[PDB]
């Protein structure tokens, strides 16, 4: 009834996350849109000392999955509500050729003015 | 070392959760009754069709754990900003007499 995408969140920069960093991981149906805002599942957690690679376990309602649809996971890391890291590509899951259920994601570091 | 508490979130009421229900699970140091319970770990997730028992896997930094301190998991469920379910029980983990790592939590209803 309940199934999961597992994986990790990492980045390449040699910098630590503060205890108040917030990780968000999303599962989306991207069959009809490359960047839908609607999600199938979404999890967020505080890092509070944890450092990359960070583990996640994203549960979802398996009934929401159709074999003919395309699904992807993405992730961001925020500090004080501002973006610090984000995935810049789709990570296909479930119905992709490798029937992927475990995703090591590599995020890009970002900043605003 | 990243370590984990696993478990489930349930309630007794024969009622379903809407797709926009938000579950929050907390790991806290409850050694002191009066202190602000220190949060070791916290996650939230949306149910979007999932129904109880809801599974959770709560990761935490093993360095945060202190010998002989008391630790507990707790949880709440909110819908459209309204509290609907909350734990009302101590769920001791890690340093409890069973060194518990997997917790099936039973939440009470909040029927406002």
Q: What is the resolution of this structure in A?
A: 1.6
CA atoms within 13 A on the CB side of B68: 0
In sequence order, which residues have a C-beta less than 8 Å from that of residue A49 and are 6 or more positions away? A19, B60, B61, B63, B64
- Residues of B whose CB is below 8 A from A59: 45, 50, 54-56
Q: Contact A50/B59, CB-based, under 8 Å?
A: yes
CA–CA distance from B41 to each of A89, A103, B29, B44 (Å)? 28, 22, 10, 11
Option in B2, B41, B63 nearest A46 (CB): B41
User: Which method resolved this structure?
Assistant: X-ray
Inter-chain touch A48–B39, beta carbons under 8 Å:
yes
Backbone dihedral region for residue B48 (phi beyond 0: left; psi -120 to 50: alpha; all else: beta) = left
Of residues A82, A109, A103, A87, the one with CA closest to residue A4: A103
Q: Please give the sequence-ordered ranges of beta strands (E in DSSP) within A35-111, or none if there are none.
A: 41-46, 54-61, 71-79, 82-86, 91-93, 102-109
**Residue B60 φ/ψ, nearest 5 degrees:** -150, 160
Chain A 70-99, residues with CB within 8 Å of chain B CB atoms? none
The number of residues in chain A equals 113
Residue A113, min C-alpha distance to chain B (Å): 30
Q: Which of B19, B52, B60 to mutate to test the interface with A (most CBs of A within 10 A)?
A: B60
Cβ atoms of residues B50 and B72 within 8 Å: no
């Amino acid at each position: 009834k309940i199934q999961s995408i597992t994986g990790s969140v990492a980045y390449r920069e040699r910098i630590a996350l503060p205890d108040n960093a917030v990780v968000t991981v999303y599962l989306q149906d991207v069959s009809l849109a490359d960047a839908p805002a609607t999600v199938i599942a979404k999890q967020n957690f505080i890092t509070n000392g944890m450092q990359v690679p960070l583990e996640f376990n994203l549960a979802y309602d398996s009934r929401k999955i159709k074999a003919s649809h395309r699904y992807s996971v993405s992730a961001r890391i925020e500090v004080d509500g501002k973006l610090r890291f984000i995935t810049d590509t789709h990570y296909g899951v479930i119905t992709d050729p490798e029937a992927t259920k475990h995703v090591p994601m590599m995020l890009i570091g970002v900043h605003g003015e």
